[PDB]
Amino acid sequence: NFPNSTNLPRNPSMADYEARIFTFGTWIYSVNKEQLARAGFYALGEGDKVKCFHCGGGLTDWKPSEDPWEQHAKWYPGCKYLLEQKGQEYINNIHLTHSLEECLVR
Ligand SMILES: C[C@@H]1CN(CC(=O)N2CCCC2)CC[NH2+]1
Ligand SMILES: [Zn+2]
């Protein structure tokens, strides 16, 4: 499934922060659930699989050093939720950061 880059959320049932939060339940994983919800993510109930309510972009295997908004920008750069909450300056920063990384680690 392709990522939603329209201004309309793919899962409007999950558009409220309240809604997203309930999906987690007791959360054992290394990334903060409220942080994840704030970044538009709700839990799938399979390991630490989250999905963004707006773009539908899915992310998994959360390391403690990984930020929700950073990972959102990384994999779902076309998400209009992301664009709106963070701004384009932030998204460019994130991209330049990750690309410069993949060329210093590399
Ligand atoms: C949270 C972070 C996400 N990474 C990539 C991922 O989960 N993807 C699934 C769809 C394509 C990118 C793995 C490491 N942990
Ligand atoms: Zn998104």
From Swiss-Prot:
A single cellular component GO annotation: nucleoplasm
Cleaved signal peptide residues: none
BIR repeats: 17-82
Phenotype when changing H95A: No effect on interaction with SEPTIN4 isoform ARTS
A GO molecular-function descriptor: protein serine/threonine kinase binding
Impact after mutating W62R: Reduced interaction with HTRA2
Sequence positions that bind Zn(2+): C52, C55, H72, C79
Region (Required for interaction with SEPTIN4 isoform ARTS) location: 14-29
Ubl conjugation found in the keyword field: yes
Record's subcellular location: Cytoplasm; Nucleus
Record flagged with keyword Zinc: yes
Sequence position, cross-link Glycyl lysine isopeptide (Lys-Gly) (interchain with G-Cter in ubiquitin): K74, K80
Keywords: Apoptosis, Cytoplasm, Isopeptide bond, Metal-binding, Nucleus, Phosphoprotein, Protease inhibitor, Repeat, S-nitrosylation, Thiol protease inhibitor, Transferase, Ubl conjugation, Ubl conjugation pathway, Wnt signaling pathway, Zinc, Zinc-finger
Tissue specificity annotation: Expressed in colonic crypts (at protein level). Ubiquitous, except peripheral blood leukocytes.
Region (Required for interaction with DIABLO): 81-102
Listed GO biological process terms: copper ion homeostasis; defense response to bacterium; DNA damage response; negative regulation of apoptotic process; negative regulation of tumor necrosis factor-mediated signaling pathway; neuron apoptotic process; nucleotide-binding oligomerization domain containing 1 signaling pathway; nucleotide-binding oligomerization domain containing 2 signaling pathway
Main localization category: cytoplasm
Post-translational changes noted in the entry: S-Nitrosylation down-regulates its E3 ubiquitin-protein ligase activity. Autoubiquitinated. Ubiquitinated by TRIM32; leading to proteasomal degradation.
Domain notes: The first BIR domain is involved in interaction with TAB1/MAP3K7IP1 and is important for dimerization. The second BIR domain is sufficient to inhibit CASP3 and CASP7, while the third BIR is involved in CASP9 inhibition. The interactions with DIABLO/SMAC and HTRA2/PRSS25 are mediated by the second and third BIR domains.
Entry's disease: Lymphoproliferative syndrome, X-linked, 2: A rare immunodeficiency characterized by extreme susceptibility to infection with Epstein-Barr virus (EBV). Symptoms include severe or fatal mononucleosis, acquired hypogammaglobulinemia, pancytopenia and malignant lymphoma.
Function: Multi-functional protein which regulates not only caspases and apoptosis, but also modulates inflammatory signaling and immunity, copper homeostasis, mitogenic kinase signaling, cell proliferation, as well as cell invasion and metastasis. Acts as a direct caspase inhibitor. Directly bind to the active site pocket of CASP3 and CASP7 and obstructs substrate entry. Inactivates CASP9 by keeping it in a monomeric, inactive state.
Subunit and partners: Monomer, and homodimer. Part of a complex composed of SEPTIN4 isoform ARTS, XIAP and BCL2, within the complex interacts with SEPTIN4 isoform ARTS and BCL2, SEPTIN4 isoform ARTS acts as a scaffold protein and stabilizes the complex. Interacts (via BIR3 domain) with DIABLO/SMAC; the interaction inhibits apoptotic suppressor activity. Interacts with HTRA2/PRSS25; the interaction inhibits apoptotic suppressor activity. Interacts with TAB1/MAP3K7IP1 and AIFM1. Interaction with DIABLO/SMAC hinders binding of TAB1/MAP3K7IP1 and AIFM1. Interacts with TCF25 and COMMD1.
Family that this chain belongs to: Belongs to the IAP family.
Protein name from the UniProt record: E3 ubiquitin-protein ligase XIAP
Organism: Homo sapiens (Human)
Lineage of source species: Eukaryota, Metazoa, Chordata, Craniata, Vertebrata
Included stretch of the parent chain: 249 to 354 of 497
